[PDB]
């Protein structure tokens, strides 16, 4: 059941709406386990240095996951969630509920205080995801679909966001990609080229804004990104699921029998 | 939207049951209109003399259809049905209901009284359908499916029946094919070869039996076929429908754009 | 209650979804009556020769509308609809239901048989709409909104289509604009520039495809456009309404009174 | 998200009723925290000595609030309420309920017994609110609305009441303003001028009346104000809420792109 890396799939439901398979839920679980590409469900010539970054980031995320795996109850569904711009994972577990800020880029006054091996671990993670998106887009271009006009990149926004955060804590393409979660596929297929213009001044003074609402029972902090149009968008939760894969098995038919051979009447 | 002749298609529905597209409902309508293969929704090298028989039978069925088209009301859905062994078509029409015995082979005491042109018309029809089935089976062998074990030939039984009727009013393959409407696909894919054995005696004395039930309000006549096992099966009605084809259009994508060309960061 | 020509407006509803006001329903009614710009609900320096084309097309559409106005019953809501690519209007009328193919460009084997005054009338209509869209887009750029990322050009597709039809029966911009009814606003605000590439070959052989489905009770004809990606889209109905304008009246306040004048205590 | 001080806002709801935003709920919370104007959600030239009184009163209210903050449970919505004429705040708190008489002016036989710093604190509070109302009214005059005829000052009555209490425990404008909670906006916009006449005799003998009803389970005390018409009104509870502010963010669009530049056909 192997597949190319960074893939997506399209499935139909009707009462003919399609839905997309991301390559993330499984990707998240793989990074949870530190699993290596060989023992994965996964033609990568144009993917330079893919494996070393892959497995280094897999291990780094593996121990980070273990950091909270240690506390987990035996007894204590799966509805993993992600938050921009510190790109934090969110879990739940019942008897029959935690988080981790994978890439905190909002404020880091430990540029040299944090050890360089940890920094390289995060850099490996962010580059891995960067190339993962590059693969996902190559995949989009490689095969077009009837349903290319029905959905948007919207899931992947925060990852691109994390990219630009590193950019400030070290671009035009990834930024403007992030700017439109609602952006459609074949559009990008058309105008990957001229995505060049804000020019310098709206990002020299912070890429994002931070606002807290004093809800009188707490302090709902929130991050408010600004996009190259010079505009803004609130960051929002996005609960995940993952489709229960079909039992279907490959036909792999070998008989390929001839029919003219049989002495049919005429 | 062209396709190969004699095709079938497989469609999924779930609350993952598949259903088959026959190539008959459309085929019936085409024979209704006498339409020629060029102006059809339809790689036929192994189909000898296909076109001349095709269009001759199309015309013959066209006038036969007109025989009852003349009487039809303007105002007076579509639920066409077929009956073995005279292979009769059945129509309905409402304001917002007839039949025709296309190939009556039960009793014909007009072997020379019926003109030879009419006889050639029916022979063209029966051969056309014969090759149509041969194509359908070549199609089955050409592409196998996950769902090859889920359905049977059951729709096409009466046509094979009509074949054997001509055989008596002029075989092993088509007979035994007809014998099992419940017969599965890939089985035939396996054992097309040895389908040879009843030997002479159960068919010298009539291929079928005829029984009428005196239901006290009418005489329900019925034909009871016997199969090479030396067994029997009652012939049954089979109401038809036809799926409302999807609006889907061919992507026919031409851009096939490169991606390494864009100056992505790394 | 005057407004600039070719305008749009944005209105909120919630149980904060916005909806757009087109400038079409009213525009359609104005062309129905042949009304001139002076006696309209409507800063047009950059609109060359606007009035002469405006009123000529208004008159032409007025008589064309009268062509079916003559037959209308006294007694016999309003749910006007439009169809590409002949860009036909659709009406209904009850006691307490027609159409007209305004710009038939699918097939016209009367290039010189049709008088030149009629041809100039249609050309005036199509240019009028062309500039109307140019104004609509200037309007989009002039004022951006919070909700610029929530809707698409989708209403106006067929008009752009009619444009390209004239192009064949005499471009890159209007074509690619039409190609994406789902296209978002501020995107166009960004990349109006580089919209240049199919190159010659997919449009030399017909801009559109025509397919009829033999639904066994009729012949549902349909037109299937192809877009610069080399892809396709089915053309679809779009029922219209028009919001019942609010009773609101301009405050136009004139008092602008001072307050420090009153002998407030401190 | 800064705004001018003492503001109000107008919001629409329909099944087009408007509602007003006060500048009080937030103001109450700010005085709860002793917050200073700089770190507030808030062009004040005509506001003399605003900041010193602002922050002094903020601190005074802050400790007064702390007086009951000390007792509050950790675990133990928000429905703050105010009562004239001692202008007392009212709170509630649940697991998942107190008051404070901010400006008791009904009876104070401690004119010199109460220290002068406390007295200056209350005087700062009352002047702060006095100017706050003056700003609110300047705001009303500065921008008029369609809905100026749909609501009344009714929320702010008790504050004006507290004013007149100080007047006795040290006017025509603030008194008559208080006299009509049901008074409409643009009226005041018209006749701020001649609000002069009861003349001396109905207020020399107490501004208000006090009546207790022996409800046989308690003593429901109540204060009964008298207005310059020589009439009366019972003082009433007014439960508060505060709208959950919209997530909306400022567009702050910067592109302001030209359109004639693109080589549109005509």
DSSP D152: B
| CB of B144 closer than 8 Å to CB of B138 | no
Count Cβ atoms below 10 Å from residue D144 Cβ, excluding itself.
17
CA-based nearest residue in chain A for residue B246: A16
Q: How many CA atoms lie within 13 A of B253 on its CB side?
A: 15
Q: How many CA atoms lie within 13 A of D102 on its CB side?
A: 29
Q: Which residues of C58-73 are buried (b: 16+ CB within 10 A; e: fewer)?
A: bbbbbebbeeeeeeee
Sign of the alpha-carbon dihedral angle for B245, B247, B251, B252: positive
CA-based nearest residue in chain B for residue A187: B255
Virtual torsion, Cα A221, C11, C251, C44, nearest 10 deg = 110
Please, which experimental method was used? Answer: cryo-EM
Virtual torsion, Cα C56, C58, C64, C68, nearest 10 deg = -160
Strand runs labelled E in chain C = 9-13, 17-21, 81-83, 88-90, 99-101, 208-214, 219-227, 231-234
Q: Is C191 on the interface with D (CB under 8 A)?
A: no
Measured distance CA(C176)–CA(A186) in Å, rounded:
12
Are B and D neighbours with ≥3 CB pairs closer than 8 A? no
- B29, B251, B254 member nearest C214 (Cβ): B29
Count Cβ atoms below 10 Å from residue B115 Cβ, excluding itself.
10
How close D223 gets to chain C, by Cα (Å)? 26
Contacts of D1 in chain A (CB under 8 A): 211
Residue C181 to residues A113, B243, C10, Cα–Cα distance (Å): 53, 29, 19
Phi, psi dihedral angles at C34 (to 5 degrees): 65, 15
Bridge partners for A231 per DSSP: A227
Measured distance CA(C138)–CA(C161) in Å, rounded:
20
Q: What is the total residue count of chain A?
A: 266
Measured distance CA(A249)–CA(B144) in Å, rounded:
13
The chains in contact with chain C, meaning 3 or more Cβ pairs closer than 8 Å, are A, B, D
Contacts of C170 in chain D (CB under 8 A): none
Picking from A205, A214, A222, A235 by the largest number of D CB atoms within 10 A of its own CB, the best residue to mutate is A214
How close A30 gets to chain C, by Cα (Å)? 34
Q: What angle do CA D21, D27, D28 make, to 5 degrees?
A: 110
| CB of D233 closer than 8 Å to CB of D224 | yes
The chains in contact with chain B, meaning 3 or more Cβ pairs closer than 8 Å, are A, C
Q: Is B252 on the interface with C (CB under 8 A)?
A: yes
Measured distance CA(C149)–CA(C127) in Å, rounded:
29
| CB of D31 closer than 8 Å to CB of D58 | yes
| CB of D223 closer than 8 Å to CB of D213 | no
Element (H, E) at C118: helix C116-142
Chain breaks in chain B (C to N over 2.5 A) after: 15, 42, 76, 96, 170, 197
SS3 D41: coil
Measured distance CA(B30)–CA(B39) in Å, rounded:
10
Measured distance CA(B149)–CA(A197) in Å, rounded:
59
Element (H, E) at A227: strand A219-227
Q: Is C77 on the interface with D (CB under 8 A)?
A: no
Measured distance CA(D181)–CA(D178) in Å, rounded:
6
- Which residue from C9, C151, C189 is spatially nearest to A230, judged by alpha carbons? C189
Picking from A16, A147, A149, A233 by the largest number of C CB atoms within 10 A of its own CB, the best residue to mutate is A149
Chain breaks in chain A (C to N over 2.5 A) after: 15, 42, 76, 96, 170, 197
- Which residue from B40, B25, B125, B29 is spatially nearest to B69, judged by alpha carbons? B29
| CB of C176 closer than 8 Å to CB of C197 | no
- D29, D78, D253 member nearest A231 (Cβ): D253
Phi, psi dihedral angles at C173 (to 5 degrees): -65, -60
Bridge partners for D13 per DSSP: D17
Structure tokens at C104: 């038939």
| CB of A215 closer than 8 Å to CB of A196 | no
Alpha helices in chain B (DSSP H): 25-33, 50-69, 116-142, 157-168, 173-179, 185-190
Q: Is C171 on the interface with B (CB under 8 A)?
A: no
Q: How many CA atoms lie within 13 A of B241 on its CB side?
A: 6
Q: Is C213 on the interface with B (CB under 8 A)?
A: yes
Given the structure tokens 């425990």, which residue do they identify?
A: D169
Element (H, E) at B220: strand B219-227
The DSSP bridge pattern shows strands A99-101 and A208-214 to be unpaired
Q: Is B49 on the interface with A (CB under 8 A)?
A: no
Q: Is C232 on the interface with B (CB under 8 A)?
A: yes
SS3 B70: coil
| CB of A170 closer than 8 Å to CB of A162 | no
- Which residue from B36, B178, B25 is spatially nearest to B89, judged by alpha carbons? B25
| Rg, Å, chain C Cα set | 22
Given the structure tokens 């469900």, which residue do they identify?
A: A41
Are C and B neighbours with ≥3 CB pairs closer than 8 A? yes
For chain D, give me the number of helices (H) and strands (E)?
6, 8
Q: Is B189 on the interface with A (CB under 8 A)?
A: yes
- Which residue from D102, D119, D132 is spatially nearest to D26, judged by alpha carbons? D132
- Which residue from A251, A241, A229 is spatially nearest to A155, judged by alpha carbons? A241
Cβ–Cβ gap B266/A130 under 8 Å: yes
Cβ–Cβ gap B252/C232 under 8 Å: yes
Q: Which residues of B151-168 are buried (b: 16+ CB within 10 A; e: fewer)?
A: bebebbbbbbbbbbbbee
Residue D102 to residues D88, D90, D105, Cα–Cα distance (Å): 5, 10, 10
| CB of D99 closer than 8 Å to CB of D89 | yes
Q: How many CA atoms lie within 13 A of D121 on its CB side?
A: 17
- DSSP secondary structure of C159-219: HHHHHHHHHHT---HHHHHHH-TT-BHHHHHH-SS------STTTTT-SEEEEEEE-SS-E
Picking from D255, D256, D257, D262 by the largest number of A CB atoms within 10 A of its own CB, the best residue to mutate is D255
- Which residue from A183, A165, A176 is spatially nearest to A227, judged by alpha carbons? A176
DSSP D131: H
Collect all residues with Cβ–Cβ distance below 8 Å to B31 and sequence separation of at least 6: B57, B58, B61, B62, B65
CA-based nearest residue in chain A for residue B254: A144
How close C180 gets to chain A, by Cα (Å)? 8
Measured distance CA(B44)–CA(B135) in Å, rounded:
9
SS3 A240: coil
End-to-end CA distance of chain C: 43
Edge to edge, the sheet with strand A99-101 lists A81-83, A88-90, A99-101
- Which residue from C57, C175, B226, B146 is spatially nearest to D264, judged by alpha carbons? C175
Given the structure tokens 């030399």, which residue do they identify?
A: C204
Collect all residues with Cβ–Cβ distance below 8 Å to C159 and sequence separation of at least 6: C87, C129, C133
Bridge partners for D220 per DSSP: D213
Count Cβ atoms below 10 Å from residue A21 Cβ, excluding itself.
15
| CB of C108 closer than 8 Å to CB of C114 | yes
Collect all residues with Cβ–Cβ distance below 8 Å to C21 and sequence separation of at least 6: C7, C8, C9, C10, C11, C243
For chain A, give me the number of helices (H) and strands (E)?
6, 8
Measured distance CA(A190)–CA(C228) in Å, rounded:
9
Count Cβ atoms below 10 Å from residue A3 Cβ, excluding itself.
12
Cβ–Cβ gap C187/A180 under 8 Å: yes
Collect all residues with Cβ–Cβ distance below 8 Å to A55 and sequence separation of at least 6: A34, A36, A37
Measured distance CA(B224)–CA(B236) in Å, rounded:
10
Chain breaks in chain D (C to N over 2.5 A) after: 15, 42, 76, 96, 170, 197
SS3 B29: helix
Contacts of A265 in chain B (CB under 8 A): 130, 171, 173-174
How close C200 gets to chain D, by Cα (Å)? 18
Q: How far is CA A216 from the centre of its chain?
A: 35
The chains in contact with chain D, meaning 3 or more Cβ pairs closer than 8 Å, are A, C
| CB of C126 closer than 8 Å to CB of C103 | yes
How close A259 gets to chain B, by Cα (Å)? 7
Q: Which residues of C202-238 are buried (b: 16+ CB within 10 A; e: fewer)?
A: ebeeebbeeeeeeeeeeeeeebebbbbbbbbbebeee
Structure tokens at A120: 């390289």
SS3 C238: coil
Measured distance CA(D259)–CA(C142) in Å, rounded:
10
Virtual torsion, Cα A42, A48, A49, A50, nearest 10 deg = -20
Residue D156 to residues D44, D66, D174, D177, Cα–Cα distance (Å): 21, 25, 11, 10
Given the structure tokens 């390209």, which residue do they identify?
A: C164
* Helix%, strand%, coil% for chain D, nearest 5: 35, 15, 50
- Which residue from C172, C166, C173, C154 is spatially nearest to C235, judged by alpha carbons? C154
Alpha helices in chain A (DSSP H): 25-33, 50-69, 116-142, 157-168, 173-179, 185-190
Structure tokens at D33: 């925290």
Element (H, E) at B219: strand B219-227
- Which residue from A153, A169, A238 is spatially nearest to A208, judged by alpha carbons? A169
Measured distance CA(D9)–CA(D4) in Å, rounded:
11
Measured distance CA(C11)–CA(C203) in Å, rounded:
40
Cβ–Cβ gap B252/C229 under 8 Å: no
Cis bond upstream, residue B115 (ω within 30):
no
Virtual torsion, Cα A191, A195, A197, A199, nearest 10 deg = 160
Phi, psi dihedral angles at C190 (to 5 degrees): -80, -55
Residue A14 to residues A19, A213, C15, C159, C236, Cα–Cα distance (Å): 11, 41, 27, 31, 19
| Rg, Å, chain D Cα set | 22
Phi, psi dihedral angles at D202 (to 5 degrees): -85, -10
| CB of D24 closer than 8 Å to CB of D155 | yes
- Which residue from C38, D50, B205 is spatially nearest to C30, judged by alpha carbons? C38
Alpha helices in A143-259 (DSSP H): 157-168, 173-179, 185-190
Element (H, E) at A17: strand A17-21
Alpha helices in chain D (DSSP H): 25-33, 50-69, 116-142, 157-168, 173-179, 185-190
Edge to edge, the sheet with strand C81-83 lists C81-83, C88-90, C99-101
Measured distance CA(C123)–CA(A129) in Å, rounded:
54
Residue A151 to residues A155, C184, D112, Cα–Cα distance (Å): 10, 13, 75
| CB of B106 closer than 8 Å to CB of B168 | no
DSSP D154: G
Collect all residues with Cβ–Cβ distance below 8 Å to C249 and sequence separation of at least 6: D146
| CB of A136 closer than 8 Å to CB of A156 | yes
Structure tokens at C156: 């106006």
Measured distance CA(A203)–CA(A169) in Å, rounded:
13
Residue B226 to residues B166, B175, B209, B212, Cα–Cα distance (Å): 16, 10, 8, 17
Measured distance CA(C48)–CA(C35) in Å, rounded:
19
Cβ–Cβ gap A198/D249 under 8 Å: no
Measured distance CA(A159)–CA(A102) in Å, rounded:
11
**Angle B116-142/B50-69 helices, nearest 10 degrees?**
120
End-to-end CA distance of chain D: 43
DSSP D148: G
């Amino acid at each position: 059941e192997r597949r190319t890396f960074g893939s997506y799939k399209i499935e139909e439901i009707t009462i003919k709406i399609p839905i997309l398979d991301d390559g993330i839920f499984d990707l998240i679980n793989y990074l949870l386990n530190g699993t290596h590409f060989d023992k994965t469900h996964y033609d990568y010539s144009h993917l330079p240095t893919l494996e070393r970054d892959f497995n280094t980031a897999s291990n780094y995320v593996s121990e980070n996951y273990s950091i909270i795996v240690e506390e987990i109850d035996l007894n204590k569904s799966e509805s993993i969630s992600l938050k921009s711009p510190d790109f934090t994972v969110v879990l739940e577990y019942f008897k029959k509920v935690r988080e981790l800020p994978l890439l905190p880029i909002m404020c880091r006054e430990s540029e040299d205080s944090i050890s360089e091996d940890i920094l390289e671990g995060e850099g490996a993670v962010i580059q891995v995801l960067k190339m993962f998106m590059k693969g996902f887009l190559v995949h989009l271009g490689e095969n077009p679909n009837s349903y290319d006009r029905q959905l948007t990149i919207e899931k992947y926004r925060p990852l691109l966001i994390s990219i630009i955060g590193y950019e400030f804590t070290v671009n035009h393409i990834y930024y403007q990609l992030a700017t439109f979660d609602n952006y459609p596929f074949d559009l990008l297929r058309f105008q990957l080229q001229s995505l060049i213009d804000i020019k310098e001044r709206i990002e020299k003074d912070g890429l994002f804004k931070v606002i807290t609402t004093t809800n009188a029972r707490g302090q709902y902090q929130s991050v408010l990104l600004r996009g190259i149009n010079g505009s803004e968008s609130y960051l929002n939760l996005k609960r995940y699921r993952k489709f229960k894969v079909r039992v279907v098995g490959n036909v792999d038919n070998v008989i390929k029998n001839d029919f003219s051979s049989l002495k049919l009447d005429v």
